[PDB]
Structure 1
Amino acid sequence: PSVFLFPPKPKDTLMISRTPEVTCVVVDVSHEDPEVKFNWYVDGVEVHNAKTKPREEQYNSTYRVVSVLTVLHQDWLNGKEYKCKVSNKALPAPIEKTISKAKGQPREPQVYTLPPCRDELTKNQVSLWCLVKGFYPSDIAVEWESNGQPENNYKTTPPVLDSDGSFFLYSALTVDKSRWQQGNVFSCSVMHEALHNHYTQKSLSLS
């Protein structure tokens, strides 16, 4: 019997409209000891509002049991610790698992847009670049758009630890050449806790 504790998504913690949840997942729950019990704590204080989905037996004849705790957005952003305690008569001692936001002072992202270079314009497609650096923690969200509408053909690298302890990434949005020299303006939305309104936006166009 194994337990896995998953954090909220970054977008969910950064917008009061959305619902951030911590998710405790238990797998390899045998048939001879099926019942599972979750105890939740935030900063060592037990909470009772979690919601434990009914068990679902997998195609390997073991059960998957999930427990979802909704967190207050500013609790997570203030680094409370969420502890999932899982109890099962199969186990000798119950399994504890703790998750939190990374410790460390938040640092504002620097969002630099970058046009293609001289030598990619031979091809039909064109990559426009969005450099985001110097942020902490690595929880962040990056989206692209133009004309007030989302772009789908973008890929974003994982956050990468920099020399100075912050993080950086790049987002590359690839569009048609004819879209870019028409002179459509493309924009790089970035969501991170250390930005004002948790949001910023940098636009890009030929000139």
Structure 2
Amino acid sequence: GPSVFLFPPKPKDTLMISRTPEVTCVVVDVSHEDPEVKFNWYVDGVEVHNAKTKPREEQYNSTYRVVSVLTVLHQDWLNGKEYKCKVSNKALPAPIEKTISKAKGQPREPQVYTLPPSRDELTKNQVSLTCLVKGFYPSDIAVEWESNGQPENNYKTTPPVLDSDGSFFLYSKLTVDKSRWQQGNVFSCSVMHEALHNAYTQKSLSLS
């Protein structure tokens, strides 16, 4: 029969008030013989009615895919409420339940430090700007770089690493042309995490 997959909002969506976090209930392997699918949604066990269900869609394997999207309140998700998708279909003897909620654990505020390139890297035509983010908990986090308030794309970020104290750390590396670093351009490492005041903090880095 059909299977159900329940997706969480992205961290950044729950941590920025102007964004809209959603959880997504995807239903695959629905048959032509039993194509009707019903969604029921619950927040902490209370039925909720404002989900948006798109009409079913083809799939090249002759099964249907159907998705229901539930907008969540930023505060509900961050406060650990449980989101349940129920999904009914005639091929099933019993409707399928999936539940999802934010990672548990006592939250711990990231500390964020920017580190300029080693002097030894100064020969090269590109140099590395490092943002260390440490001491955070829930591992869920967003780290981004900008300059002139616009995104700097050329970075990579390590996964969270469990530290000796049970918190997480990571590093992000932004690679820039040496000239930009030498012209005194200011670069900024932005971190969004639930344990941050207003869920955000920024540290800047420039030639000293």
TM-score by length of 1: 0.94
**What is the CA distance between 1:157 and its match in structure 2?**
2.1
Report % sequence identity: 98
| Whole-Å separation in 1 of the counterparts to 2:48 and 2:12 | 24
**What is the CA distance between 1:179 and its match in structure 2?**
0.8
- Map Cα deviations across residues 37-63 of structure 1 (whole Å, 9 max, x no partner): 111111111111111111111111111
In structure 2, relative to structure 1, the CA distance for the partners of 1:181 and 1:6 (3 Å cut) is same
- Give 5+ residue unaligned stretches, structure 2: none
| Whole-Å separation in 1 of the counterparts to 2:96 and 2:164 | 36
| Whole-Å separation in 2 of the counterparts to 1:111 and 1:79 | 25
What SS does structure 2 have at the residue aligned with 1:158? coil
| Whole-Å separation in 2 of the counterparts to 1:163 and 1:114 | 22
In structure 2, relative to structure 1, the CA distance for the partners of 1:127 and 1:61 (3 Å cut) is same
| Whole-Å separation in 2 of the counterparts to 1:202 and 1:91 | 53
In structure 2, relative to structure 1, the CA distance for the partners of 1:60 and 1:193 (3 Å cut) is same
What SS does structure 2 have at the residue aligned with 1:179? helix
- Map Cα deviations across residues 62-98 of structure 1 (whole Å, 9 max, x no partner): 1110001111111001000001111111123221111
Aligned residues: 207
Q: What residue is the counterpart of 1:26 in the other structure?
A: 27
| Whole-Å separation in 1 of the counterparts to 2:165 and 2:61 | 46
TM-score by length of 2: 0.94
- Map Cα deviations across residues 126-157 of structure 1 (whole Å, 9 max, x no partner): 11111111112122211111223221111222
Output the aligned Cα RMSD.
Answer: 1.4
More displaced stretch, 144-153 vs 23-32: 144-153
More displaced stretch, 173-182 vs 116-125: 116-125
| Whole-Å separation in 2 of the counterparts to 1:95 and 1:127 | 49
More displaced stretch, 173-182 vs 154-163: 154-163
- Map Cα deviations across residues 112-138 of structure 1 (whole Å, 9 max, x no partner): 111122333332111111111111212
**What is the CA distance between 1:162 and its match in structure 2?**
2.6
- Give 5+ residue unaligned stretches, structure 1: none
What SS does structure 2 have at the residue aligned with 1:28? strand
More displaced stretch, 139-148 vs 16-25: 139-148
More displaced stretch, 135-144 vs 58-67: 135-144
In structure 2, relative to structure 1, the CA distance for the partners of 1:163 and 1:39 (3 Å cut) is farther
More displaced stretch, 107-116 vs 139-148: 139-148
| Whole-Å separation in 1 of the counterparts to 2:23 and 2:104 | 17
More displaced stretch, 162-171 vs 35-44: 162-171
What SS does structure 2 have at the residue aligned with 1:56? coil
In structure 2, relative to structure 1, the CA distance for the partners of 1:163 and 1:83 (3 Å cut) is farther
| Whole-Å separation in 2 of the counterparts to 1:5 and 1:162 | 30
**What is the CA distance between 1:176 and its match in structure 2?**
0.2
Q: What residue is the counterpart of 2:181 in the other structure?
A: 180
Q: What residue is the counterpart of 1:197 in the other structure?
A: 198
In structure 2, relative to structure 1, the CA distance for the partners of 1:192 and 1:96 (3 Å cut) is same
From the two aligned structures, give the one with the greater strand fraction. Answer: 1
